[PDB]
Design a binder for this molecule. Structure first.
Ligand code: HEM
Length: 291
């Protein structure tokens, strides 16, 4: 099963920069969301879940089809609350009806990271909307109450190795958990609408206490008011994961480069790019454009 990237007819770099700018201007404008965190975090969370359904064994799921628009996938328990990022992006799709849904969902993620001061993420167009019966079943996204063995095995379904898994998890510097969504409650650190290596620093530097939350699930809580999921805590339990955690705590530039490659890879899994496809785009930030 092959999905071949097909560029939206007659569109080029500057067309997608416009779509970037509209997302970015709206990000600026809707700052009150989730007690003033803004929609940045939920946008990267949406891009990760629409990509996270991929199965490298048969190329089912993945970002290409844009299948999150169908009710079986948006009703996935693993996706509770993500309807807020979808709603955010509705005005944008309306303004640019020519872009595909998978292109827009993935670009929203890229846009969020860059505007939150993270690294440039190269992004490629050409995902094409596929029909409702291509929507993958629920249950492909990962559980939080597991250990490093689980985590390692999970991400291998996405063709990700140890380094990629630890870089990717650094996105938990952003936003927070919400009891009503997931059964976990609280943020991972203090600067949660700015992309930094804080997740790794907090993981190593705080005084974590294992507790049961108000939904009766176990999570790691610090005196600072931070939390870690068991899967997060895994990363300092496995000695291979811990070595890389130390690395990124110690070197944010290294973390930014590895996150950048890994996030692009996640959003492009399952997509075959023609030799003559355009080169990956690197979008300018609003700030870089004077907007
Ligand atoms: C073993 C894998 C992971 C687990 C179990 C996991 C689990 C969680 C949970 C339970 C939430 C809270 C949901 C809520 O209550 O709203 C969450 C949110 C979030 N996750 Fe992950 N996740 C994982 C990996 C990732 C990765 C790969 C990304 C992205 C590169 C990511 C991005 C984030 C973001 C930014 C948030 C905040 C969303 C917002 O604030 O609403 N996650 N995740």
């Amino acid at each position: 099963l092959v999905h071949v990237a097909s560029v939206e007819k007659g569109r080029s770099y500057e067309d997608f920069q416009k779509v970037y700018n509209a997302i970015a201007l709206k990000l600026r404008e809707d700052d009150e969301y989730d007690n003033y965190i803004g929609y940045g975090p939920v946008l990267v969370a949406l891009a990760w879940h629409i990509s996270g359904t991929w199965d490298k064994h048969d190329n089912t799921g993945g970002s290409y089809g844009g299948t999150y628009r169908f009710k079986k996938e948006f009703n996935d328990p693993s996706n509770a609350g993500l309807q807020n990022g979808f709603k955010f992006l509705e005005p944008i799709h309306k303004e640019f009806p020519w872009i595909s849904s998978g292109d827009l969902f993935s670009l929203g993620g890229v846009t969020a990271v860059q505007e939150m001061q993270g690294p440039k993420i190269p992004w490629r167009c050409g995902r094409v909307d596929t029909p409702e019966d291509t929507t993958p079943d629920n249950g492909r996204l990962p559980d939080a109450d597991k250990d490093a063995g689980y985590v390692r095995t999970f991400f291998q379904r996405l063709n990700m190795n140890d380094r990629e898994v630890v870089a990717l998890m650094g996105a938990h510097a952003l936003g927070k958990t919400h009891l009503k969504n997931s059964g976990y409650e609280g943020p991972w650190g203090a600067a949660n609408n700015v992309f930094t290596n804080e997740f790794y620093l907090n993981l190593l530097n705080e005084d974590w206490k294992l507790e049961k939350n108000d939904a009766n699930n176990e999570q790691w809580d610090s005196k600072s008011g931070y939390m870690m999921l068991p899967t997060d805590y895994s990363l300092i339990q496995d000695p291979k994961y811990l070595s890389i955690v130390k690395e990124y705590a110690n070197d944010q530039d290294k973390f930014f480069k590895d996150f950048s490659k890994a996030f692009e890879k996640l959003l492009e899994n399952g997509i075959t790019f023609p030799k003559d496809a355009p080169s990956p785009f690197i979008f300018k930030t609003l700030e870089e454009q004077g907007l």
